[PDB]
Design a binder for this molecule. Structure first.
Ligand SMILES: [Mg+2]
Ligand SMILES: [Mg+2]
Ligand SMILES: [Mg+2]
Ligand SMILES: [Mg+2]
Ligand SMILES: [Mg+2]
Ligand SMILES: [Mg+2]
Ligand SMILES: [Mg+2]
Ligand SMILES: [Mg+2]
Ligand SMILES: [Mg+2]
Ligand SMILES: [Mg+2]
Ligand SMILES: [Mg+2]
Ligand SMILES: [Mg+2]
Ligand SMILES: [Mg+2]
Ligand SMILES: [Mg+2]
Ligand SMILES: [Mg+2]
Ligand SMILES: [Mg+2]
Ligand SMILES: [Mg+2]
Ligand SMILES: [Mg+2]
Ligand SMILES: [Mg+2]
Ligand SMILES: [Mg+2]
Ligand SMILES: [Mg+2]
Ligand SMILES: [Mg+2]
Ligand SMILES: [Mg+2]
Ligand SMILES: [Mg+2]
Ligand SMILES: [Mg+2]
Lengths: 50, 205, 262, 151
RNA sequence: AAACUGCGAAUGGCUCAUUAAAUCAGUUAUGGUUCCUUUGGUCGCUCGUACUUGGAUAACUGUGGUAAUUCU
RNA sequence: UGGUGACUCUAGAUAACCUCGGGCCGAUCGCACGCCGGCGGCGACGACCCAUUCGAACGUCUGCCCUAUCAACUUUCGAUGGUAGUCGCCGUGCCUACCAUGGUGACCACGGGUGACGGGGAAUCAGGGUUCGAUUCCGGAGAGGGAGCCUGAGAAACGGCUACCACAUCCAAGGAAGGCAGCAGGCGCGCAAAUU
RNA sequence: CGCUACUACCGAUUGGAUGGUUUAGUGAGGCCCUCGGAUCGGCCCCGCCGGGGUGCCCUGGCGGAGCGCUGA
């Protein structure tokens, strides 16, 4: 399940390929326009909200 | 959808008419605006030619005219008491043209007491709290008092309207079409029309 | 047919345009304007078929887009503009002025007028109504509405309009003894003095008109246009002075012209 | 003749009947003013319409209708509806193959005002075209002429 | 160029299945209605930031999804 | 004030109203440039309303082929008329409520059939007639069959959309896309009709 | 009466096939009404505040929260 992540401050976007369901379980059952703490995506994602 | 064509009808001889074309847009009809009494709700309809029809769904205020006194005021619509076409319209409190309605009498009483300097629709307790004692008696120059005394000679209301003013509610007829103009206007019933509708209302119950 | 029609079949065009049959399927289809479709002369027909200034429609467009044609003193760049009765067409580049006047055979003749006479026109009045704080209003056959007209001006009268300003200068009342032209029907193009008008309430009124040669003819009231006061016209008449020759005298005149030719 | 027989109140809309009246001018009733119009085309207003009290919104003289277009004549054949009658128009239709006519007729339902009383089966009526008044009625009786042998 | 906006796309072309006072034709009516456009009138008639107001969105730039569309 | 054969017309006066799904009362563009410290000439767009043009839509009057082995029909679910309303751009059983019992017919109603779209017209014809008119002009209807709508001044539009019925295209089987009675062209049908 | 052929009828079969009307029930889809309220704002409130007057509020620009108030 690809993730299309955009950073409006710099205007840069990236397509990440996350194939681990444990990481993706954070977003499950969440509706659009809901802010979720993206921590399970990776260690470098610590403190990020998407 | 809803149609208003004359070709789906039988001929005057009773024979069936076979249609020669399908339903046209200019023969359309629309669902009725069963206008109720409540806080104002009006929807607009785009009609033929690009013009606009106002479709009143709820109304609680109207512009009603006292013809004998030529006093037109914006009053509050209270209840529906008679409908010459259907009784379910009275039962459901639907405002249509020629429906008999009870309207608040306060603006007319205010105009009467300010124009004739005579009490109207008052009980015998004679409270007459200030700013009404002033509007009823006041102090005026000789010319102004003379003009008011001249007015008082031809200020006599029919007994039926006086009774209604005592109750605080007048009987009125709606002369507008709320489902087409979005307005419930009309005139205060008086004279033989008032007697006719009073008799009809009493006989209905 | 949903919505308005935008084409005109050539064989369905009005006959007084004198359009042939083999040039095409369609006809110019006059634009909406001050004159009715059946009673007008489109600019292209006049500029190409009548005056032969242009050979094709594209040449007519090229002429009109240089702003050379003026209809009643205003530049008209629409090639299908409906120019009708009593209209004045001015071409300053070549310096001529025409007035659209019906010929005896019910066709718009090429009638050249002097530049002095091109400063005004005559309009039949169609209705008078009061509006907008009691201001009277006149409506003419040319679809121009004039406020504050003379109180004497009644329906079926004729008013002289100064084209530059658009105001009334004088008028002729509709009455017996006044000269008139027939602008529709069988007697279209005929000029004569009004003899009598018979009224049929709820129906059309019939007007009897006598020529200068003694011939009489009737028309409907809506087909009468007052041209002059008494016997004298207020405009210049075409070469045929409004009198209709029978086919016999027309043939005799043609034969006499042939004999005198050469 | 009581004129209030419907659920609604019958009244000429143009006339205002609630004008204030002082007691000094209370000689019985005010004799409610009557609205009536003169339809053109040289037709006289019946005295009944002027001095009557009936309410008829389709009346050519006291109602809201305009006489326009065709004026025809017929013979009254039936008077079994309220305020409207059925008249018969007879004519001859030509057939060119035989150079001969055939008798034809058509009925017409025309509105009859209460101003025309004592209308019998057999008299002549001059009717005039108006706007559609019902599904089948497009004419209003303007004049009634008695039959050739009336009393 | 593109894209937004405006206009047109209700004309034209085709065919004759339906349709028997219906269509249609001549004659009348709308004083019983709607009307883009063209043309003329009207547009300080109203006694109550302006030396110019606000938020977007497309084109464009970049990340894409689907086997597939004038999809998004 | 003005008008019409005829307004309950037009204009006037008065008391109010004036819809948050709002009515007008210019926050727009171009070209020339100017004069006396501010005023301005041509245009182009836009706009409520009135008139005009192009219409359209309902009506009035008269006119249509065969058939009685179709003689009574319509009316309980509007048939005919009245009163009040709803809806509609408006007049109207157009629809509703309550009333009345009406309305058409041997002068052919009602029903059935048509190898029936209607006219302008065509063939033949001494005179009278008979037959044809799908077909280039006018009017109508339809876009495989019904139905329902959006937008728009104007469609119940199909070279617009939404369904169902009948056909039918691609598919990775999850889905997507259809409408030549337009011009060519193919199949089929046929005695019968042209170039992608 | 006998020989051959054709047409047509009655047709037992409780004929079918196609089509067209309806009774009763079900009923897609649009449209209207009454609700519904995923989201997106604006005002307000603060941490945040640029400067005017002067710490002094009248307006920029943020973040947080308020089933605060309202709009779509
Ligand atoms: Mg409009
Ligand atoms: Mg067409
Ligand atoms: Mg007339
Ligand atoms: Mg575009
Ligand atoms: Mg345009
Ligand atoms: Mg369009
Ligand atoms: Mg204009
Ligand atoms: Mg009614
Ligand atoms: Mg009725
Ligand atoms: Mg009913
Ligand atoms: Mg057929
Ligand atoms: Mg035929
Ligand atoms: Mg044909
Ligand atoms: Mg055929
Ligand atoms: Mg055609
Ligand atoms: Mg169609
Ligand atoms: Mg097909
Ligand atoms: Mg369709
Ligand atoms: Mg196609
Ligand atoms: Mg098409
Ligand atoms: Mg083809
Ligand atoms: Mg073959
Ligand atoms: Mg052949
Ligand atoms: Mg059912
Ligand atoms: Mg539904």
């Amino acid at each position: 399940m690809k993730l299309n992540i955009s950073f409006p401050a710099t205007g840069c976007q990236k397509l990440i390929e996350v194939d681990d369901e444990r990481k993706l379980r954070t977003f499950y059952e969440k509706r659009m326009a809901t802010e979720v703490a993206a921590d399970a995506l990776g260690e470098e994602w610590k403190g990020y909200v998407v | 959808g809803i149609s208003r064509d004359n070709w789906h009808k039988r001929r005057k001889t009773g024979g069936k008419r076979k249609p020669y074309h399908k339903k046209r847009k200019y023969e359309l009809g629309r669902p009725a605006a069963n206008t109720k009494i409540g806080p104002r709700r009006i929807h607009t309809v785009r009609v033929r030619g690009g013009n606009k029809k106002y479709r009143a769904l709820r109304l609680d205020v109207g512009n009603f005219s006292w013809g004998s006194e030529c006093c037109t005021r914006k009053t509050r619509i209270i209840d529906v008491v008679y409908n010459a076409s259907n009784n379910e319209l009275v039962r459901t409190k639907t405002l249509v043209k020629n429906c008999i309605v009870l309207i608040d009498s306060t603006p007319y009483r205010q105009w009467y007491e300010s124009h004739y300097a005579l009490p109207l629709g008052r009980k015998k307790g004679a409270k007459l709290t200030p700013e009404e004692e002033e509007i009823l008696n006041k102090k005026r120059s000789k010319k102004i008092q003379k003009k008011y005394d001249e007015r008082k000679k031809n200020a006599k209301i029919s007994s039926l309207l006086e009774e209604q003013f005592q109750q605080g509610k007048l009987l009125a007829c709606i002369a507008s079409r709320p489902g087409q103009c979005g307005r419930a206007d009309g005139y205060v019933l008086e004279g033989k029309e008032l007697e006719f509708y009073l008799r009809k209302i009493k006989a209905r119950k | 047919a949903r919505g308005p029609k935008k084409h005109l079949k050539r064989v369905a065009a009005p006959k007084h345009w004198m359009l042939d049959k083999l040039t095409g399927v369609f006809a110019p289809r006059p634009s909406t304007g001050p004159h009715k479709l059946r009673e007008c002369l489109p600019l292209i027909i006049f500029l190409r078929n009548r005056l032969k200034y242009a050979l094709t429609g594209d040449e007519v467009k090229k002429i009109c887009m240089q702003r050379f044609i003026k209809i009643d003193g205003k530049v008209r760049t629409d090639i299908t503009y409906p120019a009708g009765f009593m209209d004045v067409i001015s071409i300053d580049k070549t310096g001529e002025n025409f007035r659209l006047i019906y010929d005896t055979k019910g066709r718009f003749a090429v009638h050249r007028i002097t530049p002095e006479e091109a400063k005004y026109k005559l309009c039949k009045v169609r209705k008078i109504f009061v509006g907008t704080k009691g201001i009277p209003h006149l409506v003419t056959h040319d679809a121009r509405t004039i406020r504050y007209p003379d109180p004497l001006i009644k329906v079926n009268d004729t008013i002289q309009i100064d084209l530059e300003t658009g105001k009334i200068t004088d008028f002729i009342k509709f009455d017996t003894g006044n000269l008139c032209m027939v602008t529709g029907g069988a007697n279209l193009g005929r000029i004569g003095v009004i003899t009598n008008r018979e009224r049929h309430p709820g129906s059309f009124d019939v007007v009897h008109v006598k020529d200068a040669n003694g011939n009489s003819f009737a028309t409907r009231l809506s087909n009468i246009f007052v041209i002059g006061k008494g016997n004298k016209p207020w405009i210049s008449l075409p070469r045929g002075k409004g009198i209709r020759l029978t086919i016999a005298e027309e043939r005799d005149k043609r034969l006499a012209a042939k004999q005198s030719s050469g | 003749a009581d004129i209030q027989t419907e659920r609604a109140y019958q009244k000429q809309p143009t006339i205002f009947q609630n004008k204030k009246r002082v007691l000094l001018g209370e000689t019985g009733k005010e004799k409610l003013p009557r609205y009536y119009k003169n339809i053109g085309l040289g037709f006289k207003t019946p005295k009944e319409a002027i001095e009557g009290t009936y309410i008829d919104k389709k009346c050519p003289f006291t109602g809201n209708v305009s006489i326009r277009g065709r004026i025809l004549s017929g013979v009254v054949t039936k008077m079994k509806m309220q305020r409207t009658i059925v008249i018969r128009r007879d004519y001859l239709h030509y057939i060119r193959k035989y150079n001969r006519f055939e008798k034809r007729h058509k009925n017409m339902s025309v509105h009859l005002s209460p101003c025309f009383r004592d209308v019998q089966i057999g008299d002549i009526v001059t009717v005039g075209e108006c706007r559609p008044l019902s599904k089948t009625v497009r004419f209003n009786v303007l004049k009634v002429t008695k039959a050739a042998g009336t009393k």
